[PDB]
Amino acid sequence: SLSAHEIRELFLSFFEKKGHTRVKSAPLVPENDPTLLFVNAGMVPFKNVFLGLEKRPYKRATSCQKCLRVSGKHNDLEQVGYTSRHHTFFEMLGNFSFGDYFKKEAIEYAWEFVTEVLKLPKEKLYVSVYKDDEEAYRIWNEHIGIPSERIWRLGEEDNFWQMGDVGPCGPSSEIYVDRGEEYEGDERYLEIWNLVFMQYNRDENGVLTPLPHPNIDTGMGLERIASVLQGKNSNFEIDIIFPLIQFGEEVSGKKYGEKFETDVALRVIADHLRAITFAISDGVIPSNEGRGYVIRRILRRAMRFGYKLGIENPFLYKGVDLVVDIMKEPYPELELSREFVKGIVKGEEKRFIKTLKAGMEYIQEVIQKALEEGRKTLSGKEVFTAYDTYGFPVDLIDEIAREKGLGIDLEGFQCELEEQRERARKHPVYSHLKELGKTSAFVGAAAL
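Now predict its structure.
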């Protein structure tokens, strides 16, 4: 079955056996990239090394990178809790080639690891390739020996990766595990490894041209593969995550696996505990803008859901100790920041907990009132009150109102935001007018 931790060392040691230099995970916070809030994939820190802007004593690297998909084009936050596969924080195993080996080697190593190391049966494995990538197809079908019936030729939306609107890109090949006739769609053929074949460079006119030195970029989500080997049907039930669910159960006195809504809260708490512990350890301080407001919302979202389960006192700070104890092996640095992080979280919860309760009462009040008078949305003045007066993040206001089938007057809120900005011009963070509505979803009222 292999524990999560074992799958990590196996993956890292396996590639070292292939001349790959084990590179320590880069911190979640990008050293010099103010446009990207958090690292979202293994290749991020190696970006310039893939572009030739940097160099390294090695041509082959591997690593288990700390990732967060809570911003930009890779924002999964809104879904965390509702599904069994979405996370804010997660670990991505990866092997990279900087102008070295390519498709052939990338596939051989992958197939070897999956079949020999993880011991996954070859008969229950499927692979996808870009329809126009005859090269990849051949390697799988002939070289590796995968029967045609287990190879899928899909389109650009399925098997083509790009570094950006412009720049290096290329076809990709994903490895799926057929979990059995009991599951459906992507739950039955759970993708576990994405092999990106950086083969081209897209110019400003969309024209593709080969790269003088094609690169390799792979990413295997740790929790995901662990759920497979561990025989679980949810990433949250794996060895390094289920203990956090149990924690939620103990604090709230509720049981996991009895009510979807109850599970939502428990998952959110478990996921969010990991995000805040890792983010904060890596130097993120809760604030009303940028990276700090991302952790603030996440941390505030767990509070709300925790409160929804009946927890009346701060509790997240206790979960930090569990995250550190579970992950100290792979990330020993966590023990040296344990108390620091615990103190940050406990301070945050004690700062907003009463406001949260008072605000939840107000919010449910207007909501109830709204659906009693036939209204289908929360007005701009109401969305503004919860946001300004109770400090509730706009996304949290929307999620709460959604549970009752109510939306939010984005336009009214927009204007309501301008009137306030005017109250500062008639009676940090910058934003054009008519943008206050979009900016407010990423900053605290005070920031504006």
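The longest helix spans residues 333-370.
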